[PDB]
Amino acid sequence: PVFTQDVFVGSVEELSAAHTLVMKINATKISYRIVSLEPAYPPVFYLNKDTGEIYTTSVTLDREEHSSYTLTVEARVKQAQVQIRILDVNDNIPVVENKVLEGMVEENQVNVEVTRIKVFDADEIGSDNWLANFTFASGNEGGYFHIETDAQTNEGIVTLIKEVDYEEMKNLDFSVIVANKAAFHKSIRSKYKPTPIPIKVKVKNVK
Amino acid sequence: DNINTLWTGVNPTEANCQIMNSSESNDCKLILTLVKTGALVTAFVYVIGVSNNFNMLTTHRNINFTAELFFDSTGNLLTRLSSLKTPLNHKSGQNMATGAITNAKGFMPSTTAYPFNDNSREKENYIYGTCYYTASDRTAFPIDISVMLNRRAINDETSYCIRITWSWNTGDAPEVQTSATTLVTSPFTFYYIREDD
Amino acid sequence: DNINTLWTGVNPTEANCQIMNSSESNDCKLILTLVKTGALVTAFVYVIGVSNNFNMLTTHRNINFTAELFFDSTGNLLTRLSSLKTPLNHKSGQNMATGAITNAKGFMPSTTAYPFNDNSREKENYIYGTCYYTASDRTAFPIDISVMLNRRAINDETSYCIRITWSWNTGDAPEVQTSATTLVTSPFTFYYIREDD
Amino acid sequence: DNINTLWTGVNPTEANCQIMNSSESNDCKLILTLVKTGALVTAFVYVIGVSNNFNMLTTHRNINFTAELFFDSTGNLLTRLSSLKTPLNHKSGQNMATGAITNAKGFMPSTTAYPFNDNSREKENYIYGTCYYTASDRTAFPIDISVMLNRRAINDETSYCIRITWSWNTGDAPEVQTSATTLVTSPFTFYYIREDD
């Protein structure tokens, strides 16, 4: 048989169900077989020797373990190469890496950063599954602090846009919840427990 | 054989129960099937939302709602006091069999195993379980069910009580205002020793 | 149709079992019901503490207590070894139908489904589930239940074995000594494939 | 009385279902029983591993596999399409009663209860549960189960459908490459509403 392309490319989603048609090897009875698999482990792909359609097996794929798979295949000699990229699904919750969060605000200052909150997500870097969406659980009902997501480091930057009175002894201590920008996958949804991370605000007594 | 079933039927055309007190009419369909199995009754219960105020419950992170069924000494459903406003009946095809019932007493919780007005045996009047709400994005949020059998009678005419309370307290709301379609709870099956015929 | 049920009866007057090995007399009430459902048996089992030693268990963090029932070639309970010291009988209202039993074997667990002394099939002899203890503060505390069917027979006359092990391991006991009143578990329902009549 | 059962038998001699499409032949035993209980059908299902490819699944952190049963308008299993390749039949001792089956339509999910191709009632076609796997260290390992009823028909001969999807996702595989012996699941019992005979 003669293959129609030396390099085939397909994609399948992370946590794909069993017998999900990944892609199709084209050549032109034709009997196929898998010559080799990198990283060869675990056996997550199945080649139907009669039709040449590559499916997923009962071994659920895992992207954070293996980025992409390289198959060397034969048809009945010539060997063809196939690259299968696993598409990420938001199946890992972010965990706040920084623990002791005690911001130091300066009295009567506007448009100044209050603090930084480091975050970790095992999801694909740069995708919506990886960026962190911050919501103010409590302590910012008065509209003083604003939080943004530095996508470069996936960090929650807390800044201030309102002048504060130190002598007022305003209890600016607050607490936040962390969640990825894209909705969580069905695997961990209903397992998501939004435990709030607090942060303390310290006010400089400007003289 | 059909005499051994006591159910509301399968998907009654119109809403037949009022769970939320705020509702001025029936706000959902309560599908309940009680089957005699030797010395026990197999109860099979779930709810299908109808009214918008009921279906909107899918958008709240913490919800709870209760269905109370009260039966007189002969087992007939007290519609005026209960949450199910359509009397139970036997099986005819996939519907209720229109006609009188005389053996309803056999389906009710036994007044011995589940006694009225006794604190010492109180703990024996509670069953617990869990169902699932399937989301529009194909999740499965667990709903905690607490069932109480005849352990308290509010009125004199009440002779058997079955209070089923669904609740959840989750992280993310199952649905959003636009994606919310209906509140259908996965079937819940429980067992209770039945009263003597 | 009372012949299709084999139970200890609704709450007996006195303690009817010896679960904890430390107790010298009947220490609690074991309520067990078995109902034939076609080719299966539905078991419906729970406990009601009586002795102070048994009731005090709720004040402990790490408990595990087992009720063991054994049956001969005729399905009759071997009281001398089984924890449940009172035999099982058919239904008669809320009590045992005092009389001879012939089809007890029909309720017993199938040896073909659940073999004796065969390592290769060991995993077929285990069932698992959860029951709930209702706390005095109106909260449900989980309690694991592990059921072993047959597998191991101690002696020659043992032909069927049902071991029901209740357990719980937490960091905070469900109750305290001043609030612990009685150890009562919500009914646990399980199923098994039954021996031929 | 044996007509109220339709099951695969107890521990069939050879594998009776090809659960993995990658397997060249039958790879696991699907022990399934359906019992009529008035208006409901109780299904009782579990899986026994035979082939090495299926037995090795115990060693992987994430696994999912589905057993699909398609039944035609007269309740007979379409073997050429389903995972389980042996037609069901009634109970006869611990075997299948070789003979013609006409009442199988009563064991099938009701079309009015679990519709085909109706989005508004889609959520009604979902049931959930938890099986357990007995690790070699005598510890229970949960396995989530999703049971879909009807909801789609592959080809024109499919009148009823039951899809049982087992799956687990955890950080440590229940076994290791040396300890794995076989993959046997603890029984799962679920209920559903049945169609008219």
Author numbering:
A (entry chain D): 108 to 135, 146 to 193, 204 to 334
B (entry chain C), C (entry chain A), D (entry chain B): 129 to 325
Article sentences:
Based on the successful strategy of our previous work, the structure of HAd11K/ rDSG2 was solved by cryoEM. During the image analysis, two main populations of particles consisting of the HAd11K in complex with either one or two rDSG2 modules were identified and two 3D reconstructions were obtained at 3.5 and 3.2 Å resolution for HAd11K in complex with one or two rDSG2, respectively. The binding of rDSG2 to HAd11K is very similar in both populations meaning that the binding of a second rDSG2 is possible without interfering with the first rDSG2. The tips of two loops in EC2 (around residue A125 and residues S175, T177, respectively) are in close contact with residues located on the apex of the HAd11K (in particular residues N190 and N192). Several putative hydrogen bonds are predicted in this region which likely contributes to the binding. Regarding the interaction of the EC3 module of rDSG2 with HAd11K, the loop region centered around R316 of EC3 fits snugly in an apical region of HAd11K defined by two loops centered around D265 and D300, respectively. Several hydrogen bonds and salt bridges are also predicted in this area. As reported for the other two serotypes, −3 and −7, the structure shows that EC2 and EC3 ectodomains bind at the top of the trimeric knob and that D265 mediates central contacts with DSG2 (19, 21). Interestingly, the critical D265 residue interacting with the EC3 domain of DSG2 is also seen in HAd11K confirming the importance of this pocket for all DSG2-interacting serotypes. We, therefore, produced a D265A mutant of HAd11K and subjected to BLI experiments, clearly indicated that D265 is, indeed, a key residue for stabilizing the complex with DSG2.
Among human species B adenovirus, HAdV-11, has the particular feature of exploiting two primary receptors, desmoglein 2 (DSG2) and CD46, to mediate cell attachment. Interactions between HAdV-11 and CD46 are well-characterized and clearly depend on the fiber protein, but the mechanism whereby HAdV-11 engages DSG2 has been still unresolved. In this study, we elucidate the molecular basis for HAdV-11 recognition of DSG2 by resolving the structure of extracellular domains of DSG2 in complex with the HAdV-11 fiber knob protein. The structure shows that DSG2 and CD46 engage different HAdV-11 residues and interfaces without overlapping.
